[PDB]
């Protein structure tokens, strides 16, 4: 089995997955920070 | 979905050749000019719904 070669998707590429998880971190934490700040300024638009 | 970029970016593209009252190359009045001036003066800020009326 698989004496032929390593078909490209067969073995992982650890640079790509690193970039993808990069996008996960950047995107997600950016979303959370967006939430917090919009809620904050929303609090400013009104008062206690 | 008609988009307006050219008002957003602040650039004139087709607004110059648009209507007869625009600044001409060396300003020469159009035949019906003044009446363009009054039709657009009347219909300017309104919505073409009651501008008709």
């Amino acid at each position: 089995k698989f004496y032929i070669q390593e078909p490209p998707h067969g073995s992982p590429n650890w640079l790509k997955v690193g970039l993808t998880l990069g996008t996960s971190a950047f995107l997600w934490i950016y979303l959370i920070k967006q939430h917090n700040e919009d809620v904050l300024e929303y609090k400013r638009r009104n008062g206690l | 979905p008609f988009f307006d970029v050219q008002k957003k970016l602040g650039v004139d593209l087709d607004h110059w050749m648009t209507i007869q009252s625009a600044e001409q190359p060396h300003r020469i009045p159009a035949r019906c000019h003044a009446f363009e001036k009054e039709w657009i003066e009347c219909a300017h800020g309104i919505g073409s719904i009651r501008a008709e009326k």
């Binding site: - | 110059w16 050749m17 007869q20 625009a22 001409q24 190359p25 020469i28 159009a30 035949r31 019906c32």
Partner: protein, 86 residues
């Protein structure tokens, strides 16, 4: 709308009915289309130059340039169609 406008419109519609109601020769189709296109050139010219609306005088020029680079396309497709059969 004067007269000349009436007449040029009748030319326009002669070209258009000639377009739709004859499929025999293709060059004839493409032609009739192009003649109609000419009639549009004439209209825009006569009008614009009737109202002395100067800044818009391009409409004959820039309307006429696409009378060609589109038409040329037309004839190229005509040749590539003819060499299918005949």
């Amino acid at each position: 709308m004067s007269l000349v406008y009436m007449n040029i419109m009748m030319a326009f519609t002669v070209s258009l009915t000639g377009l739709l109601m004859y499929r025999s020769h293709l060059m004839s189709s493409l032609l009739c289309l192009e003649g109609m296109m000419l009639s549009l050139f004439i209209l825009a010219t006569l009008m614009i130059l009737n109202s002395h609306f100067t800044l818009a005088s391009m409409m004959p020029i820039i309307l006429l340039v696409f009378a060609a680079c589109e038409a040329a396309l037309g004839l190229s497709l005509l040749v590539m169609v003819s060499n299918t059969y005949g």
